[PDB]
Symmetry: D3
């Protein structure tokens, strides 16, 4: 496989309409989770991609496997764990901030949080081009963190999305120490991050200065996500910026994962960072127009149509 | 009780999609009515609020009372009237004017229209901090109008939303004479109005001139709603303006009630007009994004988050 | 025209699910009204049919005329009345009695209740083969009852469905008096009734005895509805019985009208009572399987298929 | 308050259609939980009823409080616990057994499982007529079990539903020991149970013999639920049996709680066990016709209509 | 009749949400077809309009005739053809280009494609004021194209919408040849077109130059659609421009037909090009806010309201 | 592979509610087609199953392949054909025959109809345990028929479901001659049929006599479907019968495919005809309770639970 990702796939329940969850009567089910969304983007851009994860021995774990198979993700290393349940979350949409979403997790002690070094096979990982994980996987348990540290030991090249979700950590100081340890121990081929995470990790906001400090930490390429203001990619002395597009927002959840998987998979195929960035932006624009996170992540050719035709 | 509101609560039937009602196949039920929406906003800002009203002895009247109880409204004075039915209305959305709604009422001779001076106990009304009603209550019947005049005599302080709904009156001249008469008779702590109503009452639309005239009529605080152009509040020699926010409109119905009840309730607890105004606009912004009038009216704390975070 | 029916067409709102209306959140709209449902069955059996009625100058009245025109009913005598509104009703399904429907009307002083003798043209009525109405039209106002009396005086032949809805009458004695009076003044070529109505009109429930007593009042054909125990038709001392079919009941409202319009239009065309009865039973069976009253009313050829194939 | 119940209220998510959850795209939200359903039945039969429970400081906990308030349950002793989350469950309907349901819980370490003796106020409990709880509350944590043991120490009279849900216990032997300890320590005024539980607790099936053995344990009245075969009530030398009714089943979850709360609240008002049983059966018939557990639980008067009119 | 249109009416299936069709689970049905949409606008502006077409002897063909009859279109020349089926299409919305729709047709060899010169009666056509068709009808088969040629030879006056749908033609050259040929043979009183079609037909996109070239081909009035930049109408060296309104786009399909039918029916009635253009813009604005093509097409009086009140 | 099936997979559009399609507004999409449904049942009983088929190069063809992959079907021989489209059909439910469905096809000249002998590789087919097809595949085109005859020559063993769909054939005589010719040419391990087909093929309906005749034709096991009267299986001198279960019917479409694929797959793995039959009926019972054909086809273990528990 070209790309191996480590994480916890989840079931997402989205309210049918905006508003506090206590007034929501209906919920639509989607398959999501940060690294799963990312894998969908990698496979849409025509690389093979394997998710290493656990699911519970239950309907929702089967849902995750079948969905992933349907979408062309290698599912051989999604292990069923009879010892716990498949994690899920709910999205509260547009309240109290319109066009934004808030996640309510039911995932503590889930089968996905039991991901562990035992699941990481030396030979398997060495025969891939790139290993990806995120700060979510580093947060969910000590053994998921140690799975990432092992997989990153064995990898030929690594990507990391900082993705700090404060609800998943005991403190921001714990998040910071955990993530910086990773950056200090390993070279990172593509780091994906944003102003909020970078303020916690480096205490800087300016993207030019963020790249200078991340580069010191061993990062080669930085994808710096600015949301409604676009995104910036850095590599060596190239800086590429691409503005966001205006579209009606249904749910922005997972937009960042679509952008990151698209960017990384194109970068891996030898596309330059300007092309990979513009495609990451096309992908993150399409997925926000619907409740689900990854159904609208474009293939390479569809993102090229979007880029040539939409304004 | 902090606030007493007098009015006719109603069941609202909202079209599932925009267009002329003859093409609408599905309707979503909401509990609404202008003073009910107002009371929901009062209790969201942490004041006690009692609605004095009648409902029919039917499922829709039980719906109104249970929903109000759920939301922390004091329902001790919503009385069940066996002689008549609970009034309802339908909303036609987006036709012939996009992003606007038209109401089709089935409330002639309803239970709520039977609200009368006998429902207004002198000691109960004296033991409240403020009494609120609207031009809709002044229109629904002569006895409901007299209930309002009686409650206003008895109140420590008063608020009035002029809310002229031409379909509820025999003529605009009648509307004008009825509301002007109430304004001349009483000091009004907070008057809520808009250009359309003020053109009828005062033959002016310029906000500064409307304030000048309402002030001589004994209005202390004026809230002047300009819809997509925002809103203005005046008190003494101070004027606050906040513009509207751009959000996708599902249904604006009840948005002025969310603004009024939020403004009045915060003003009553000592907040300045700028704060009460900005929270008013936040409340009105949230509710227009969904079908239904009051589910998304924010608490004081949620409206602060909205004002701090939404751009 | 072959058949003229006099009545008040209405908009019906159905819940999706059983239960008390205060817990129902969504309603589905259907065009209905007992005589409108009857006319749909007449035209499905290939006779021309004109409904004499009023509707309001409002979207629901336009919905009724457009819907009737869609289904082949002559709408040239459905009058728009700008002085009042189109009546409507809600159905509460399965509570507190499973598989039974209860109607909640908003029709008082409606446009339809203003049907009057002025709306009945002597020449137009004398040119039809048969005039039909029901005890609902007799109940809605004194002027509607007078419209029926006038149309029956002019008619070549008549049909009447007793359809006593106690909620529509000041007393059962009033319903009894009014319906008996029509039976004493006119020959009735087809009377449609049931044990509940007949117990009121005659103090009889036994079908054979009901025929004898109605035949003594000048009724030629009796159609006697036994719901889940089938129906029986009588003409000239000959009885025809057809058993009901077992299907899941979604909503029985209007199933009698489908049966009546089907039976009468076939009878008028020269079909025997056995054939017309079996077709009426087919029509009632299909209608009760869905929430609408008349969309599933079969054409003559589809009812023959039902009878030849369904068991 | 007449009745105090101890338990964990929950949010229920029901699939819109039958089938394995991995193929379900939509879920409808209801407020449920065994003792909450029971309280709804008590309040419908006109006794006051207090639920002692915890909910999390989250949208779903608020939902539970507001719903309960709407329905007339005393909510003063539903405590918000900021330390954990409100439990929820999903219902898989009609697969692999048609017309049956299976529950998938997300409730471990929930705020409801933290119910504890500290929540049980000596004075409060002594001033009620009856304390109810179930084998579910005894299973969810050691401290919820000790809350029940304390509340049962202080009670004037007690009801217990055995309700053994094997998924909630480490073994059936643990369930048996826990429940029998309760029966051995305390007199039980009404025990509610069924063949499955009684086989675990007493190793008997025959209901006549079940009553003989339960009576030895201090039980006064036994309600013995037989599902599709009806139910039996025993008191002293009275045995009452009432057959089930045939209705279309949408979801039987909570039917047993409707029957138990109805039975117990009527028994408390001095109705004999034949009347209380027939009403329990009417209540359990209505709730199975819809997805939710308690919206259709009848009041006393509605259950009397059902009993006199339905067959 | 005032207006005769020749075309193929169709059933449209819309997804609820953006995205590729393979992830859409629910489709909403609408009756549509470019000339049917045009006829609805003609009748909304109070002229009589007859659609000459074929449909299949199937439920979808009956849906088309009943729907057309509901809306006031003369359906006497919508022929049922038992040799083939009613054509349909699906719309894929917002993917890969947000706010754009793509049609997926199932119409090959349909009943509608068998429209032929035999269906065109000399006397009937000579009795109308104007005949309309589009480049879609020219594309569907050689016999449909010959039907248009015959109707145009007989017509008192003509309207044509170029509406080039490349998927319906063997080549763009074929579309160009066929449409130019019609323009060379006949005077056209109203040509409706846009920059994409005009670039093909004339190698011009500039509106003023388009008018000059079309005027040289015998076109009297040019209506030139610029989508989000408005529309322009030309007659006798006079230009009228009307800017578009900003509304959320649900589905633009058929918005051109609403504009064209509205513009042409007003023009025919003696309205000037400025008034007819502003009304056409009102009609297109309303249609694009919903999934259907023609339900929101306004009457003349509602379009005047839109123009006087909407900003 | 254990089983190879030859056929045309299709997209099914199921009406959201019963009735004539002209009144249906919403359609739910399912992936179906008789041999696809069959293959789902094979892989649910733990045998590998490959479908040989063509789909179009369109969204609906990608839908079919992804869904099949999700469900564990080997999709290596579902080939994408750019020359044509993926066939679809609509289901009209409950009209004119309650609890039955009618299919309206849009599949003439589809990609799937282009299945041909060139798709059938001799070595691939020889390396499977059994080949299955149906009378539908024999009907869709001459080349698809020849694909089946070629695959059957090559197979180690064969199964055939006669499945005569009169709408897919030029005459019943053609159906008869085509299927009889296949039966005379080949031994058939399992023939699945029913009275309607057997009356056409053999001019008998008596199950024992049908077995006698099919046995001389070289059929080893006969599965004879009697619908609501259950089903019979025969092998040698043994006959098993299982009656149907009473469940609410949503859509019976595909129920015979669930039965056939379940029976064949269990029979192939050594289960006796009683076991294969009872599991067949369980599968068919589950699927008729929902719209959609194959989602509720049980695994071997779930069907055992059904047989052990459902009464």
């Amino acid at each position: 496989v070209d790309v191996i990702a480590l994480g916890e796939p989840l079931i997402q329940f989205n309210s049918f309409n905006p508003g506090p969850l206590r007034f929501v009567n209906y919920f639509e089910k989607h398959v999501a989770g940060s690294e799963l969304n990312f894998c969908i983007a990698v496979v849409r851009n025509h690389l093979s991609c394997s998710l290493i994860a656990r699911v519970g021995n239950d309907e929702f774990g089967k849902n995750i496997i079948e969905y992933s198979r349907a979408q062309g993700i290698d599912t051989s290393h999604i292990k069923v764990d009879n010892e716990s349940f498949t994690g899920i979350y709910f999205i509260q949409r547009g309240y109290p901030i319109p066009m934004k979403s808030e996640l309510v997790y039911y995932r503590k002690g889930s089968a996905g949080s039991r991901l562990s070094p035992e699941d990481i096979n030396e030979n398997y990982v060495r025969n891939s081009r790139l290993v990806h994980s995120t700060g979510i996987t580093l947060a969910i348990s000590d053994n998921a963190k140690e799975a990432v540290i092992k997989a990153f030991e064995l990898a030929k090249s690594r990507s990391l999305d900082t993705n700090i979700r404060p609800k998943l950590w005991s403190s921001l100081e714990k998040a910071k120490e955990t993530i910086l340890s990773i950056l200090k121990k390993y070279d990172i081929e593509v780091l994906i991050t944003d102003p909020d995470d970078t303020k916690i990790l480096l205490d800087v906001t300016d993207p030019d200065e963020a790249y200078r400090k991340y580069k010191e930490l061993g990062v080669k390429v930085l994808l710096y996500k600015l949301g409604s203001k676009g995104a910036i990619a850095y590599k060596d002395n190239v800086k590429a910026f691409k503005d966001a597009y205006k579209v009606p927002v249904e749910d922005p959840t997972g937009a960042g994962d679509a952008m990151a998987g698209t960017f990384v998979s194109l970068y891996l195929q030898g596309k330059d960072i300007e092309y990979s960035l513009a495609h990451g932006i096309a992908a993150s624009t399409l997925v926000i127009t619907v409740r689900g996170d990854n159904e609208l992540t474009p293939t390479l050719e569809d993102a090229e149509r979007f880029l040539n035709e939409f304004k």
